[PDB]
């Protein structure tokens with residue numbers, strides 16, 4: 001899931017294909033919108049929700065085998081993955097619905113934080129070595145702005 005390509009356009013589109021059973025559709029839509037807003041806040045990139053497969057980033061929740069050659073392992077383990085910039089499945093973000101999706105403090109994984117992380121991958125970003133960075137390879141819930149100086153620098157170095 002490591003690429004070397006970047007999007008050749010800044011007006012990125014995304015489509016929420018389906019939803020998780022853990023949260024209301026309104027909460028889901030809002031969580032993704034806010035996740036994208038983190039990246040558009042520090043770059044000339046924009047994110048527009050669409051309802052077509054022609055979208056750059058197709059978002060979907062799946063369980064076990066879901067099309068690609070990387071099935072989800074169910075509870076825990078892989079939480080989700082996003083393919084780097086490119087056509088087709090590239091740029092798409094998949095979330096393991098066998099995981100408990102929630103927000104803020106408490107049990108379950110924050111869909112907001114995991115999505116922001118995945119969108120980083122969808123934009124071409126690789127894992128960061130900075131523990132406090134959103135692109136850190138390890139999930140850990142914390143309060144405060146998700147983007148660390150390292151995340152901002154990385155994304156701006158691309159766009």
Ligand SMILES: O=C(O)[C@@H](Cc1c[nH]c2ccccc12)NS(=O)(=O)c1ccc(-c2ccc(I)cc2)cc1
Nearest residue numbers: 001077078079080081113114117134136137138139
């Ligand atoms: O890192 C990921 O995107 C996925 C997929 C993956 C597995 N190995 C690699 C290697 C390189 C890129 C992606 C992946 N691994 S994951 O275990 O599902 C995972 C996803 C997100 C996060 C994460 C979310 C939010 C914060 I803040 C920090 C890490 C940690 C671990």
Ligand SMILES: [Ca+2]
Nearest residue numbers: 040041043044
């Ligand atoms: Ca902006």
Ligand SMILES: [Ca+2]
Nearest residue numbers: 056088090091
């Ligand atoms: Ca795509």
Ligand SMILES: [Ca+2]
Nearest residue numbers: 074076078096
């Ligand atoms: Ca899993």
Ligand SMILES: [Ca+2]
Nearest residue numbers: 097098099100
């Ligand atoms: Ca779930």
Ligand SMILES: [Cl-]
Nearest residue numbers: 017018019020
């Ligand atoms: Cl659905």
Ligand SMILES: [Cl-]
Nearest residue numbers: 034035037112
């Ligand atoms: Cl927010």
Ligand SMILES: [Cl-]
Nearest residue numbers: 103104110112
């Ligand atoms: Cl959160």
Ligand SMILES: [Cl-]
Nearest residue numbers: 038145146147
């Ligand atoms: Cl932020």
Ligand SMILES: [Zn+2]
Nearest residue numbers: 066068070094
């Ligand atoms: Zn997948």
Ligand SMILES: [Zn+2]
Nearest residue numbers: 117121127137
């Ligand atoms: Zn990652």
